[PDB]
Design a protein around this ligand. Structure first.
Ligand SMILES: O[C@@H]1[C@@H](O)[C@H](O[C@@H]2CO[C@@H](O)[C@H](O)[C@H]2O)OC[C@H]1O
Ligand SMILES: O[C@@H]1[C@@H](O)[C@H](O[C@@H]2CO[C@@H](O)[C@H](O)[C@H]2O)OC[C@H]1O
Ligand SMILES: [Mg+2]
Length: 402
């Protein structure tokens, strides 16, 4: 649509313009984080819980034909062996380990279980609930036929060959992706209420998923094989909504990738196009705060829009990408959010897409703030990853000190 106006990221709530990087970082950034927490995603009640324990359950030094070390880590959210946990899978390129250099990392959540990212028969088969839409499941549990069922979204061998570790966690370890899933999620025990319905500003699945990414980063900071200052957080679609909210809240993430995150991710909500606030909240009432429902059919009242979420990543490199046929995500709305975030990146001396309108397919545009659109439907393809790997080579924090 063409009948909206956006709030200016560089004007504070009180009307005073943001003229320097220090004002952005110390005043405007907290102001915008609070607006998103209260009105959109809900409040993250705390970060790392006390007594988080990391247990390496398996470590294989000759995975993928010798190309990788594969570690499985249980990240347990409390010292009691009964405490809730999540299962992290890490592949690290053996070429980099052998050189005794710490590897940079791509970290993102997976849709249907760690065993779906690669056929590798040694990955632990998740025993947690999975959605009916997961390929090759039965009775909401994974089967052996589900191994590698999502490998098309995870070019592990290529990422490793280019020098990067691959870390992942099943989103459903943190919040099962079902409308009732919060009652079996992190939110059900982390600073939980004594009873009754969740409060208007209480976080939902996207907040919980984002929090899990930050807990994975807490683990990576302890692993001698990796450089936890060089972690690119990425996600596809609903898990890209989570990646953006994680990268915005947690400035330790060195680079952020939104692959087709759409509504409530990179796409402008005020631009009424494809999925709308009412449709996302109606179909997925667990994803956002209950407060976000106030904007159902009333996006004009939103005090922020998603360009300000993208701006919260600055000055760190941010990639937003779309698919040409993916109308529901609103590709032009994703691009326009990038353009409306660009002035903040520019304040930090970075540059964004330089063209007038959505670029031609498979021609990325921008510096540390980058956009591309590829042909085809919603998905995450080898072409997307080729562009992300080039971006990481150029813009991920270097291993060398300043
Ligand atoms: O944020 C919400 C939590 O406050 C909620 O916590 C539940 C409250 O009722 C108690 O009987 C339960 O033990 C407790 O888990 O869980 C859902 C979450 O959305
Ligand atoms: O926010 C987006 C969701 O609205 C979208 O939901 C899909 C719409 O197509 C249906 O056929 C699917 O069942 C449903 O998953 O998923 C992508 C997400 O970004
Ligand atoms: Mg939309």
């Amino acid at each position: 649509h063409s009948a909206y106006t956006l709030p200016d990221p560089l004007v504070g709530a009180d009307g005073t313009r943001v003229h320097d990087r220090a004002t952005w970082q110390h005043r405007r950034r907290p102001e915008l984080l609070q607006l998103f927490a209260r009105e959109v995603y809900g409040r993250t009640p705390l970060g790392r819980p006390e007594g988080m324990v990391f247990k390496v359950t398996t470590m294989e030094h000759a995975a993928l034909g010798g190309a990788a070390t594969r570690k499985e880590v249980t990240v347990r959210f409390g010292r009691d062996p009964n405490a809730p946990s999540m299962q992290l899978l890490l592949y690290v390129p053996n070429a980099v380990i052998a050189r005794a250099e710490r590897a940079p990392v791509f970290l993102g959540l997976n849709f249907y279980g760690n065993h779906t990212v690669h056929t590798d028969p040694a990955i632990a088969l998740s025993a947690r609930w999975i959605p009916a839409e997961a390929p090759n499941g039965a009775n909401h549990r994974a089967t052996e036929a589900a191994r590698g069922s999502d490998a098309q979204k995870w070019p592990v061998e290529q990422i490793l060959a280019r020098g990067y570790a691959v870390a992942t966690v099943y989103c459903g370890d943190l919040c099962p992706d079902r409308p009732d899933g919060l009652n079996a999620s992190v939110a059900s025990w982390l600073d939980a209420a004594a009873g009754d319905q969740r409060a208007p500003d209480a976080w939902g699945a996207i907040g919980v998923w984002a929090w899990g990414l930050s807990r994975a980063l807490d683990y990576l900071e302890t692993d001698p094989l990796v450089d936890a200052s060089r972690v690119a957080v990425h996600g596809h679609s609903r898990l890209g909504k989570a990646a953006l909210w994680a990268g915005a809240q947690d400035d330790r993430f060195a680079l952020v990738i939104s692959n087709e995150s759409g509504c409530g991710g990179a796409a402008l909500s005020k631009r009424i196009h494809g999925e709308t606030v009412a449709r996302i909240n109606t179909v997925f009432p667990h994803w956002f705060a209950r407060n976000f429902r106030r904007y159902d059919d009333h996006e004009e009242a939103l005090p922020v829009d998603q360009h300000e979420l993208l701006a919260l990543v600055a000055p760190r490199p941010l990639y937003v990408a779309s698919a040409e046929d993916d109308d529901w995500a609103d590709p032009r709305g994703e691009f326009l959010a990038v353009k409306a975030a660009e002035p903040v990146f520019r304040l930090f001396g970075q540059t964004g897409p330089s063209g007038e309108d959505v670029p031609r397919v498979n021609e990325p545009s921008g510096g540390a703030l980058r956009y591309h659109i590829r042909p085809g439907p919603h998905g995450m393809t080898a072409q997307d990853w080729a562009f992300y790997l080039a971006f990481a080579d150029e813009w991920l924090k270097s291993a060398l000190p300043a």
